[PDB]
C-alpha cells in the first residue's frame, strides 16, 4: 500500500495543527498549543485508490536549517499554509518555497498554497493576491477553515493528486 | 505560568517592545501572540523568537486599541515535551 509523505509548513499560529487534526481526527482544536513536532499516519481512499498519509505537522517559523532541511528532504508534498488575517504569514510563503526548492534542487515540487481561517470576518490578505501568487508558482490555491472544515479534505487530497501527477 | 513578569517596556502607536523573565530550564523557543482583547478563536497573530531571547517587538498594531499579548514557552526535558502554561497581559485602549 502506497505511502505519501506530506509536510505542512507555514508561520506560527496559522492553523497547520488544526488543519491536520481536522483531517485525521475530524475535530476542531480551539486551544492554541504551539507545536514542536507531530507526526500522523492515516489510511484513506482518494479517488478510489487506497493509500497511507504520513503527515508531518511542523513548527512554524523554524529557526534552525538543520531541522528544516531534514523534513524538506523527505517530504514528497508540501502544504504551504498562511492565515488570511496575517499578512506577514502570506509574505513568508515565498521563503518556505525557496527553502524547499533549495533542498530539493528543483522548481517542480508538489505543493499547494493554503489560505486558512476563511471563517474570519476581518481579513487582511485578499483572495486575488493569493490566487496571483499561486498562479506565478504554478500550483493550486485552496481557501480553508479548520473551524468549519471548508476545504480541508480538498487541500490534502489535492496535494496527493499533485504528487500522483508529477 | 512559566515565563514570568511579562511587561511592556517601550511603546509607539503601532508597536510594542515586551520583556519577560526566562525560567530555570532551557527553552527551545518562545511564541508571542497578540490580538484584540476578547478576540474569538483564531483572531490573533503570532511569531516565534529563540529561547535565548527575553524580549520581542510587535509591529502593525492599530493605534489606541486594547490588545491581549501572550507568551508561550516550549522545549524538551527528560520528562518529555515541556509545555507550560503561557502568561498574558493587556495593553492600550
Ligand atoms: N477561527 C479560526 N481559528 C482557527 C483556524 N485554524 C486554527 N485556528 C486557531 O488558531 C490557533 C492556532 O492554530 P494551530 O493549528 O495550533 O497553529 P499552528 O500553525 O499549528 O501553530 P504552530 O504549531 O506552528 S506555533 C488555535 O487557537 C486554533 O484554534 C481556523 O480556520 N479558524
Ligand atoms: Mg501546530
Residue numbers in the entry:
A (entry chain A): 1 to 166
B (entry chain C): 3 to 95
What does the paper say about this structure?
The binding interface of this structure should be relevant to how 12VC1 recognizes KRAS mutants, because HRAS and KRAS have identical amino acid sequences in the effector lobe to which 12VC1 binds. Our binding data confirmed that 12VC1 maintained selectivity toward the G12C mutation in HRAS. A comparison of the epitopes between HRAS bound to 12VC1 and RAF1-RBD showed an overlap in the Switch I region, which further confirmed that 12VC1 is a direct competitor of RAF1-RBD. To examine the first possibility, we utilized a computational structural analysis method, AlphaSpace28, which revealed a shallow pocket, comprising residues V33, A48, and K50, that accommodates the Cys12 side chain.
Activating mutations in the RAS genes are frequently present in human tumors, and these RAS mutants play important roles in oncogenic transformation. When expressed as a genetically encoded reagent, it potently inhibited RAS-mediated signaling in HEK293 cells overexpressing EGFP-KRAS(G12V) and -KRAS(G12C) but not EGFP-KRAS(G12D).
